[PDB]
Structures are given as C-alpha cells and as structure tokens.
Design a protein around this ligand. Structure first.
Ligand SMILES: [Cl-]
Ligand SMILES: [Cl-]
Ligand SMILES: [Mg+2]
Ligand SMILES: [Mg+2]
Ligand SMILES: [Mg+2]
Ligand SMILES: [Mg+2]
Ligand SMILES: [Mg+2]
Ligand SMILES: [Mg+2]
Ligand SMILES: [Mg+2]
Ligand SMILES: [Mg+2]
Ligand SMILES: [Mg+2]
Ligand SMILES: [Mg+2]
Ligand SMILES: [Mg+2]
Ligand SMILES: [Mg+2]
Ligand SMILES: [Mg+2]
Ligand SMILES: [Mg+2]
Ligand SMILES: [Mg+2]
Ligand SMILES: [Mg+2]
Ligand SMILES: [Mg+2]
Ligand SMILES: [Mg+2]
Ligand SMILES: [Mg+2]
Ligand SMILES: [Mg+2]
Ligand code: NA
Ligand code: NA
Ligand code: NA
Ligand code: NA
Ligand code: NA
Ligand code: NA
Ligand code: NA
Ligand code: NA
Ligand code: NA
Ligand code: NA
Ligand code: NA
Ligand code: NA
Lengths: 46, 81, 143, 56, 82
RNA sequence: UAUGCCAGCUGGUGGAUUGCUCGGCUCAGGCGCUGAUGAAGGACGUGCCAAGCUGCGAUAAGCCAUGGGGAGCC
RNA sequence: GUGGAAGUCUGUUAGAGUUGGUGUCCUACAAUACCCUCUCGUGAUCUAUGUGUAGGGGUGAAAGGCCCAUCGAGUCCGGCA
RNA sequence: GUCGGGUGAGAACCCCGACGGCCUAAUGGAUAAGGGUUCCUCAGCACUGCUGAUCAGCUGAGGGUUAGCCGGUCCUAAGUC
RNA sequence: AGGGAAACGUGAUUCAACCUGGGGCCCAUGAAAAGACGAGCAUAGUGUCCGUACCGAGAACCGACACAGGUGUCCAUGGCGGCGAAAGCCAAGGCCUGUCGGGAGCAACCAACGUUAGGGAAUUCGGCAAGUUAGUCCCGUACCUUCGGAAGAAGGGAUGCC
RNA sequence: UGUCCCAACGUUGGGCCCGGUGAACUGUACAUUCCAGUGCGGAGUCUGGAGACACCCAGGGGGAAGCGAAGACCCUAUGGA
C-alpha cells in the first residue's frame, strides 16, 4: 500500500499512543494503558 | 510563526554521517523544503550547505541530512551545542 | 551463544546462501562477539568463517548416453515416448528439405549446368514435393 | 465456492476511510462521501430523528 | 575398555521410517547395561551416529561393533566405531 | 477400612450482605442564541521526564492589564 | 504434398469447474474443509484492478439464483413497550 | 530428525558442527493490495506461542526509511463530482 | 573503471528477451489524451513536494486464531528425463516451524493402504469401491453417418542392452 | 478383480502406558439392578419377588422412550408472507 503524508502522521501518532504509562507516573499517583493496540490483534482506522 | 530547525538529531547513525561524511542531521518542521532547510542551516551556524536530503519520519517529524562543504567541519559545528 | 545474526551477515559478506556459511565450532565465542560486518570480514580472513562449495550435477552419464544416441542407439520403439510428429516436426522437416533442394537447383543454375528453363521446371516440381531429397533430385536430373 | 470463510479472502479493497470532516472512519473513498456525517453529500451535517427514541 | 557387538534387531519393533533413532537408543541402552552405568553417562562418539545413519533413517544395519571405555568419578562410558 | 455419605471446625474461593457516596433520576427558579471578524465539531500538536484525561495553540497545562486573593505554588 | 481451420480432440501446463466415493471430518484445520476420482482447458474462456445498476428495486444462459455467513423481497436504526 | 558441543539457575525443540532428510511455478527470488512498525539492536519472560524455551512476529527501551533520471506527481479511459 | 584467490578463453549449435517481416479471420473491426519527433551546439544555473522500513503468507493480508480455507503480477530457459511448463531424481536458494514429546513387536478397535489360494459379480438398488487397460511404432479396423465422423473402433505384432 | 464365498497376514498414523498442556456437551433429586405386575395405556425410583461386597481399567454402544432442535408432517388461530 502507498501511504500519504497525512496517513503517515496518523500511523505515527498511533504508534506513540502505544507506549506504556511511564514508571514515574505510577509513583506520582500512588497507583494501565487502556488504549494498547497490537498490530495483529487490533485494527486501526482508515 | 513556525521555525525551520527544531533541534539536532543525534544518534549513532547521525554521528557516522558527521564524522565520516561531514553531514549534520536535524529535526525540522515538516512544511520546510530542502531549500529552506539549507538556508536556515547556513544562517544559524555560519557554514556552506552543499546538499540536503529529507525524510518524513515515522515519528511524525521531518528529518534532514545536511552535508556541509569541505570548507566546513560538521564535527566542530556540532561540538559547540 | 546465538550466532544466527552473524550467519545472516556472513552470508551477505561472502555473498553466499546462509546455508553455505560455515562457522568454526571452536570459535563460537569469538564469532559471538562479531557485531559488525567488518568484524565478520575479519573472522572471514582468519578462516573462522568460510563458505562451503556448491555442487553441480554430474553430466558424465549424460554424455555417454548422448554419444550412444548421437551414434544411433538407445532410440528403439521401446525408448520413444512422444508421438512421431512430436519427435520430429513434420513442417519443420519439410522446410529443411525444400530449402536444401532449392539451394541445390540454385547452384546448378549459376553454375551453368541448368538453363533458367530447366531449373524453373525442376523448382516447380520440387515445390510440388516431387523429390524426397537432394540425392533423389540429382538422380532425377540425370534423366 | 462457500460465500463464507472462502469468500472472505478477497477482501483487500479499501472503502471507508478516516473522514476529513468528522474524524470518523466512514469516508467512502470510492464514493467520496461520509456515511457518518454526510461530508461530500451535504454541507449541513447528517443527522436523523430516528437516531434516538421518538420521545427523546 | 573393550570391543562389543551390539545387536540392533530390536529396532525393527519401531516404525521403519524411524529405525535410526531407535537404534541409537538401543546402543546407548546396551552400553549402559553391559558397563554398569547410567544411560545418562553413556557418550557416543559421532562415528557411531554416522554408522547408524549411513543408509538413511530407515535402513539401519543389524549389528554394530562398538569400542567403549569406562571410568571417572561419577562413572561413565565413552564409545566409538571400530 | 479404602473409594465415600451427612453436619461442623480452620483456611481458601467467591463477592452477597450491612454500612458509605465524588454518580444518577425528577421537580423548581433564573437565564438563553453562535457563525465568513471563519462558528460548532474534528485532526494534529503542546510538558524536564508525559501514555490517558483536562487545558492550551508554534507566545501551545499558557502571554498581558485591572480588580480580588495571599504565602505559598508548579 | 503443402496449408493449419476448429465455441475440435488428448492433457492435474497455468487456470477454471465440481461427478462419484454418499470416504475423512462433522464441540472440524474449516459457520461449506481434506483426499482420491472426475469435467473444461483458443473460447459464449479464465482472471486482476478500475467502474456502473440499490431494496417491491437491481442483476438473473431462469435455480425464486444472487445483491458482504442475511433473500418468495438485504441490512441498520426508528415507528415500538 | 540423530550424535557431539555452545550458552544458561534451568535446554527434545535457542545457537555451532557433522550425519540424515523436506520444498523445485515452490517451502526459492522480486512484488500489488492489505497490514502498520510487525524491520534492526539491547534488555527481559508476568502475558502471547497447541508442550518447554535461555528463543520470538511476545514485554520494555532505544534506533531505522535519504532519489532531477524508481514510483506518485502529468495525460486521458469506463465513469465520477 | 570495476570486480576476481586465480585464470581473467575462443569457436559452435539451439536460441526466452528485444527487432523486423509475410499470410489468414470478423453478421466481432480491436481507446484516448498529454507528451515526443519534426527543430543545432557551448557553457552555467535550477530540478522543489509525497512514497521509500518490514511481511507479502500452512505466523506480519481477509477469514474472531501463529485458521490444512481464500488472496493479483513477474521469474515458463538450472541439470537428467521425456512430447512436455508432466512424473520421478537432483542443483541454486530456502527449510527441519504444515512445531509437543517419551515408551510397549506396539492387543482389541479405527483411518489410510499392500498382498492374498481356488472360484470370479455368487456381493449389491446398482460392479458402489477396487481392479483391468496403458507410453511409442507397424499391421489392421464393423454397423451406422448429416460424408465431417464413427476410430486410438475391434483385433494382431514389436519395444532392452551391446 | 477381496464386491462376495470367507476371511488372513502385513505397512503407516492413532488407539494403550508415561511427562507436559488442557477444553466442551450434559446435570430436579436419588440411583448396584433384573423379571413380572401396576400406573395417563412405553417405570433404575410404585407393588411383589429375584439378584446384589466396594473401587478401578479397557470395550463395543442394549436401555436411560440417551444428548442435540419450544415438530418441518397434521390440525387449531376471526396469525404472517
Ligand atoms: Cl514506489
Ligand atoms: Cl516470409
Ligand atoms: Mg517504538
Ligand atoms: Mg524522498
Ligand atoms: Mg502438416
Ligand atoms: Mg449471501
Ligand atoms: Mg475444446
Ligand atoms: Mg482437456
Ligand atoms: Mg468488476
Ligand atoms: Mg420452484
Ligand atoms: Mg453485515
Ligand atoms: Mg525480528
Ligand atoms: Mg535476544
Ligand atoms: Mg525495501
Ligand atoms: Mg503455525
Ligand atoms: Mg484371490
Ligand atoms: Mg446378483
Ligand atoms: Mg443376493
Ligand atoms: Mg468406479
Ligand atoms: Mg411445538
Ligand atoms: Mg404444510
Ligand atoms: Mg395472507
Ligand atoms: Na491489524
Ligand atoms: Na524531535
Ligand atoms: Na441561559
Ligand atoms: Na500525559
Ligand atoms: Na489439401
Ligand atoms: Na470434488
Ligand atoms: Na424490500
Ligand atoms: Na422497532
Ligand atoms: Na529439459
Ligand atoms: Na517445537
Ligand atoms: Na484388501
Ligand atoms: Na448404550
């Protein structure tokens, strides 16, 4: 498939949202990422 | 108004280009052309841009591989920041 | 130790199939430490990494058969599998024969043995398939 | 051929995409019309009274 | 140490396409018994392996002469073709 | 007296029950238009480290003025 | 003899199809699969991508077949408790 | 697959060698769609993997895609707005 | 220039690609437009913007799954074989991941399958299933027929190696 | 010509034992049953007898009018298409 510049931006953001809640936030909140998306098990939009 | 140069892209590969090819890599505003990147670069570091290669990254940002003239030395230009 | 990464590298550096690269069992540790293509070339030069040789099918037995068949053997009814016209293309064979006979008559003409009228008569007869071969043509020529 | 599983295999065509106007993935790239907001068909936004109970 | 002849007739009890494997097991079992040692301690030199697999996985030889030695602090045997 | 039946005891599983309420539901009074001076909505950004939410818009959890407020804040 | 015609023949060439085994499977590998067998294979042929036709309407070499596992009138939500 | 060996707290299935095999219009090589970071490296094993795992398409963190002359871009097709 | 450890060949045959001709067929007639040519040469400057990773499948796609299904193109000239892009065997390349293993001569029973004396369809709704036959050449070929065909009719013989 | 007379032997993968992984169907209760009888006329459970020490492994499926599906057949509905 041939992706456009926009599409590429979106996939990129999606990848970034795919990170984990940083360790420090755990400590700062005295205590999960519900938007975790696997490439195979999940499906993005467009 | 948006600025052309965002910051220096410093990674192992960026180093190799700098030490062996006299190139500097930067994170630039994706609306910027090679031409603009070239100018912005010369005016900020006072050097002579020979060539610019761009790539829209999977990081949402635009990367520019800027090669300086033999007259200038990437290693040094980068050492002052 | 896991040298699968290196295998991939050596195969590209030696320019050979991964399956042909050979790593010296006594130097896993060192190869294990090979991280760069250059590290690889280096171990290659020390002969710690080498490339096995590729085989080729022997054409020995093929050649002997080729000889027998070139001499006229091993082609009996019991050795044919395709239809006759398959073993020899009838149209292709006719083009061979007719050209021979047309080249023949062409020479005798220039050569003077045949008058452009005798030739013409023979040519037309040949195109009409009256001569089984050049020899048969020559024979007929001699009345 | 089974209209089931075996017919699912040819489904590699892209139709509904991320809509420029509403942000939903309902912009039919072949029709150039959004099935969600109506973008490409109507200047006004797509909306219907049946999207909710009659008295609400 | 000594030279022993291992019968591999029992590998025919195992499905034919897998004789080699079974034979290799018999050989280890044999040495372990005849040299009073744990089958864990029996080391077969590759030569033996190559002998058994010589005509493929399905055509193992009916016997095999094997040279073995016994020793060390936990008890063991090292063997090889002959 | 194995396999085992009934009841209980100690521990567990489970999350009922009781207690609690940052949420709902309904009534009532007030109030009430926005947009080409580009709205509402969306997208993508924006933090020292920042994934979500909120805010904000390349001056990006913010800039300025006046009033309030006060020794704390981010 | 030459020529090389054909909704022509043989053909697991590629590809298309789906006759029998009422085999295997039947909480499957699979909400239509596996194997052997079998039919077509220069044509009314097969096929990719693009494109048109929309629900009492399409499309149909016609079986009430097909229109996203949905068809003697699709699907979704509403009428609707 | 088998015998040795490597690493490791742990090895039938992670890695090296030999021996034995499998794939030949594909189980090889290059790609369209589609996927969307799955690519490489390092660090790991609570999850995922039809057993195990020191391995991984898994978990975490980093890195990676450079064009006047390859595509788009331009033209016009059925047709569409 | 490059590349090769080295040698760093010469001729030939058959010849995919590519080029260029001739014939035949249609109650079927086999796009368009941009653009190029037409229309020289030197030197110099400019050539921005988007894609570019990887999978491309018995684990990266669709099918709820690391699904025995489905999914387009190019490589159709690797060797023996042979009519062959067929079988079978083997290179190059890939793989031991169509991913759980250990043990019993390993019984009954089941799935796939081999061989069964004498008989030979008695089996069964039915020859279902299985089997027989087979490639190639020579001889030879009935009824019928729309004169095309029937036809590989049938039937008979040959077939290796040196 | 193993379709049959009439079956036999063998080959591979299961089946059986062991390590690891690890579901579903189904369940008012009780339940070791058999022969008879009786009952809404088709009973493991009533009545009379008979038999019956408990547990477990493997089997081929006689019974639980076995499990699966608010019977398609038929009739009825001031039902539908
Ligand atoms: Cl491209
Ligand atoms: Cl010609
Ligand atoms: Mg990342
Ligand atoms: Mg680019
Ligand atoms: Mg001819
Ligand atoms: Mg359907
Ligand atoms: Mg035909
Ligand atoms: Mg055919
Ligand atoms: Mg179409
Ligand atoms: Mg009908
Ligand atoms: Mg649907
Ligand atoms: Mg990887
Ligand atoms: Mg690792
Ligand atoms: Mg690439
Ligand atoms: Mg798999
Ligand atoms: Mg018999
Ligand atoms: Mg009879
Ligand atoms: Mg009878
Ligand atoms: Mg039959
Ligand atoms: Mg009923
Ligand atoms: Mg009826
Ligand atoms: Mg009616
Ligand atoms: Na996906
Ligand atoms: Na940056
Ligand atoms: Na108001
Ligand atoms: Na945040
Ligand atoms: Na003629
Ligand atoms: Na079939
Ligand atoms: Na309708
Ligand atoms: Na309704
Ligand atoms: Na050949
Ligand atoms: Na495995
Ligand atoms: Na039989
Ligand atoms: Na039963």
């Amino acid at each position: 498939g041939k992706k456009s510049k926009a599409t590429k931006k979106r996939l990129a953001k999606l990848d970034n949202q795919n990170s984990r809640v940083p360790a420090w936030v755990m400590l700062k909140t005295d205590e999960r990422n519900h938007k975790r998306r696997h490439w195979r098990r999940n499906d993005t939009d467009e | 108004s948006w600025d052309v140069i965002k910051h220096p892209h410093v990674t192992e590969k960026a180093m190799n280009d700098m030490d062996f090819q006299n190139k500097l890599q930067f994170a630039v505003d994706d609306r910027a052309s090679k031409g603009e990147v070239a100018d912005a670069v010369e005016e900020q570091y006072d050097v002579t841009v020979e060539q610019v290669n761009t790539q829209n990254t999977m990081d949402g940002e635009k990367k520019a591989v800027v090669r300086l003239s033999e007259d200038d030395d990437a290693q040094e230009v980068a050492s002052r920041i | 130790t896991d040298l699968s990464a290196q295998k991939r590298l050596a195969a590209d550096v030696l320019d050979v199939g991964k399956n042909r690269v050979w790593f010296n069992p006594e130097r896993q540790g060192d190869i294990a430490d090979a991280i760069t293509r250059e590290d690889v070339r280096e171990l290659v030069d020390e002969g710690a990494i080498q490339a096995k040789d590729k085989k080729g099918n022997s054409r020995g037995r093929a050649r002997e058969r080729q000889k027998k068949r070139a001499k006229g053997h091993q082609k009996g009814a019991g050795s044919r599998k395709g239809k006759a016209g398959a073993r020899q293309n009838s149209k292709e064979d006719w083009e061979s024969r007719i050209r021979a006979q047309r080249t023949k008559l062409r020479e005798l003409r220039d050569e003077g043995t045949l008058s452009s009228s005798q030739y013409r008569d023979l040519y037309d007869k040949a195109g009409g398939g009256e001569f089984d071969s050049v020899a048969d043509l020559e024979r007929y020529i001699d009345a | 051929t089974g209209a089931g599983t075996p017919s699912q295999g040819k489904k590699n065509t892209t139709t509904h995409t991320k809509c420029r106007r509403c942000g939903e993935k309902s912009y039919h790239t072949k029709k150039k019309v959004c099935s969600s907001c109506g973008f490409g068909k109507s200047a006004k936004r797509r909306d219907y009274e049946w999207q909710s109970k009659a008295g609400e | 140490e000594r030279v022993v002849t291992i019968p591999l007739r029992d590998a025919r009890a195992e499905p034919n396409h897998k004789r080699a494997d079974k034979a290799m097991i018999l050989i280890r079992e044999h040495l372990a018994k005849h040299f009073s040692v744990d089958e864990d301690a029996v080391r077969l030199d590759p030569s033996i392996n190559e002998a058994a697999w010589a005509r493929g996985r399905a055509n193992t030889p009916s016997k095999i002469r094997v040279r073995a030695a016994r020793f060390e602090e936990e008890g063991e045997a090292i063997v090889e073709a002959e």
